[PDB]
Amino acid sequence: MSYSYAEKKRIRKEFGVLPHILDVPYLLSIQTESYKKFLTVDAAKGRLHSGLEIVLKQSFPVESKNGQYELHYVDYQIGEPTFDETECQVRGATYDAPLNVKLRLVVYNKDALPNEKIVEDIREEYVYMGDIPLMTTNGTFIINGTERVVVSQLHRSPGAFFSKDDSEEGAFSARIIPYRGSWLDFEFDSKGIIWARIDRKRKFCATVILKALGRGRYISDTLKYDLTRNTDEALVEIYKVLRPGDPPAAASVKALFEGLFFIESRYSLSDIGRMKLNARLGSDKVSKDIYTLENSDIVGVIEELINIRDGKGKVDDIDHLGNRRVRSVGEMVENQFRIGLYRVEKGIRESMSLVHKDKLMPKDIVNSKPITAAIKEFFTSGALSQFMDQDNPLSEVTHKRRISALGPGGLSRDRAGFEVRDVHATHYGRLCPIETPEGPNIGLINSLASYARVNDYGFLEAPYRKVVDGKVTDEIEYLSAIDEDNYVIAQASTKLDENNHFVEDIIQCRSGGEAIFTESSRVQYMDVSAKQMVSAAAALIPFLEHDDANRVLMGANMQRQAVPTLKSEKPLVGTGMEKIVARDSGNCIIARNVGEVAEVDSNRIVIKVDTEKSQTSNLVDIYSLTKFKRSNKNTCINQRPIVNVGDKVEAGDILADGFATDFGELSLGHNLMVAFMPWNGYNFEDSILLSERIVKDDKYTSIHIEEFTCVARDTKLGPEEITADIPNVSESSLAKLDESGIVHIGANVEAGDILVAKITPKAEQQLTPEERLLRAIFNEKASNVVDSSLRMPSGTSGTVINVQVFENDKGGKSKRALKIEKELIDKARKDFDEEFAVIESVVKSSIEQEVVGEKVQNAREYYEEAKIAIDAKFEAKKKSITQSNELSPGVLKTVKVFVAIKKRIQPGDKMAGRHGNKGVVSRVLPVEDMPYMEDGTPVDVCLNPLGIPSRMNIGQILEAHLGLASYGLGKKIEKTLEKTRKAAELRKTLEEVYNSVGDKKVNLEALNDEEILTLCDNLKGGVPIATPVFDGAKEEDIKSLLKIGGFATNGQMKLFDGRTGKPFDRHVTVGYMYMLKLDHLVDDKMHARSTGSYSLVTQQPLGGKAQFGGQRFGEMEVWALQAYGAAYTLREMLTVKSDDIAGRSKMYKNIVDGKLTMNVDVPESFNVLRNEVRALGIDMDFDYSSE
């Protein structure tokens, strides 16, 4: 029942009785969808006008100053990007698209009101506007050769919000929020007086605003309190409040008051605030299209506030999802573009002031400098923008879906506590509550749920199924958060009689958004899926319901930190969410059209597509694999093809898995037999014990790639040389170094070995007389140059997979450098030309097959089109400035070195289970020592039972029993296939193994005998089982599976100690306990330091291990030392150890000498503090007191 090539190769058992009403929506849709609306217009969507085009149209007309010049926008043209994303990243250039717009200017006599501009400037031209960054189909941005992801931002929606502080009774408040600009506020008072403020200022009556414009007793109390006599007086008072100590002006105040709230550019609602305000007052008379504030709107807001004080109405909830909206990265890009456009418009108005030309074209006035800088500044320095995590494919999906309220317009980390961190009732359908940072940012990540979707207004919506006449309809609809509160929704778990009618009279459902017991008749909707509430990352964990929420959150955060192994192993127990996660992430290749593989090699895939069952196409497509691609986490990424020659394939099938993917399924862990008994105190707490077979079998070995860059710069004294000709260096050390001075590719480098050699000149050596005598005795000259070669840090071992060199610009290349560059270009073009010919040769063979079928004009230009791309590829390599980059002026040359070193799990490493149980390996034991079953198979890992009782992670025990059942099922299949390997009996054995339990009915009959033999070989290690997160198989089904395996109906089994061979009293549960390794190696954490460089300002040691590191001494540690009374330890550590320059040298000499002496005259930091005080008028000095 696999129905797919990936499914056909291995068949995974499935569980649960819930039908799949709707398939999961695309995970990356939210990131991809926002960019398209900004850069594209769809008639069906109704997005006729692109946002960028609308922004250009709004500010295009200027009419500077009666110059007979008119600026009109005609059209926008987008230039093709110079380099593809793969080429841009290798070069380090940022993927970008040129933006061009058409401006028409009309000129004429420019007389006083006659024929000013109707007879001139009939000529118009396209003017370059700037460079716009482009988004890949994966929705990621490459900047400076670095991939980046912009997190979505959640911000309070523009509108009118009424809230009352409880400090005083009747203290209601009215707030109006604009999309941009200042927002006015109204505050009630204990006396019942009304006050109006703008953002911040002196308190004043709200009546002043009405005076400027032109059962209620509140107006009477407020009117008498204010002494304002006329609107002019009120306007002068408002101007004085806005600026203090500034004289009022007759026309100055009028322009300022209208400008603050009556300027369209200055103040706009964005069409969201106006829509909310009209709905809140329910008035259609005010124009919805105009986003500017109106006198009627302000009077209505004041009326609503008075009505709330009367007691008719309800206060709004800020925490409510409907009030909060999510802002896409493209909207931020649009805002930056608008700011740049405003600056450009101001420049154009100023630019017209100087004219020195005849029939001047409208190209000189346009300036593109302002727009490019703002967008680049936002992308490079954007707080929301950050490097995407490369640890695993799941991590990349988690980061893109993440929405952060933090950033501009966002609450500060310490500002908001105990309010936004909680989960609202509306959060169930929009944001998964089990996933959040355990750090202070906890409760702000608000990771988006898998089924969560974004409406055009930016409000998240959740799919639901309507119910008619007590009968559930199959129609699926999306409900807004505000709409959802009124309706009552029943959970999908509720059973049906097959007529879509609820059997139970009383069911648990949310009518007010809070779970309650209600009759089936009142229910109006049903949940589309059980896992809809949980996030996509949460669904991966099996037996989620059995696990505690805190432990589940800890496990979910830990799984994303998992590090990929050399061989991917599919988990025996899986929710089945892994296959969707792998397909959605672009780490695997999917065939565009149905075709039969023509040639397969581990560098590219060639496929031929049949036109009869497919739309018209070239008939040949080529897919290029990526081998050992470097990652931000320094994790090797490579793609291996699962396709075979002459293998039928269909669109959407995975030709080959790429990163952390096995057979189209994401695997971050290896299955190991696990026992649950305390051993010798090796795991007293969270410690984990490893048999060592995994270390020997390379079960947990990972490959890390390290890039080292050496650059050459021109100093004032001289230009530094990377040539490997350094005095005082032996030939054997330089023997690995090539004649060019760059280490040979593929050559193992010991720690501290020279990767590149550089010499920098020195002057005014001023050698001391003893040094002079030494030079005279040996006739030794003093070098005027010093060597600063690049060497790998100690404790690091690797081989050089790739070497990159960039030459100088504007300088003719040397024969070795110039010849090397030409040779590299020819090899890339020559390999491409032969490779391009190979594709051309395959097309020619296909034509020969179709020679009877007419190819004379059918593919005449097909070869020509391929030739143009090859020429462009040759041009692109020579299209560079000659250094492959600008290089930054003052940089002579740069070199890039890539080293890949394998890593194997060792003691002190950290392993975290999917259930959230985590441990650090304490020791490695011999295979004989590890406990074994009566069969004698060893137990790879032993776990502590006490920890499971303390934390309710009951899911892990159930998974271990399920894993044991899967292990038992595999052994029976191995016994059946060990002898008499015939398809007919194997089919019966497979029917018993899969159809014995469950209603899945895999229908293995469809698979041919040849497929059956491969499937049996694949299942030898284990039989895959898929469990729904809330639809997991019950204990009875697992017990039946254990019986089929022939194991007793319990997890525990008899075991014998290896050392004495005597069985332990009491049986011990054995489970697969699938495990993953977190990215926390102990190799980089050792941080051993004895003597290190000191901070220049404080003469104190550097920290963090960046250079020599060292451990800072805490103030609390000083308190503990004072409690101990060890003054000698405290005094010595503070002076000689840290800032005593005289003491440190003396201490080092004494330690080398071995003689005992102590000098602690003073600490340098105290002297620096006295100097800082001395600069101020206050004077601090040491003194002697005889009094």
Binding site: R243, P244, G245, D246, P247
Partner: peptide
Amino acid sequence: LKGKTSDPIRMYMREMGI
């Protein structure tokens, strides 16, 4: 006027513009 405004530019301009 003498509003106690801290900024010098506002104070200087008022005298200069008289």
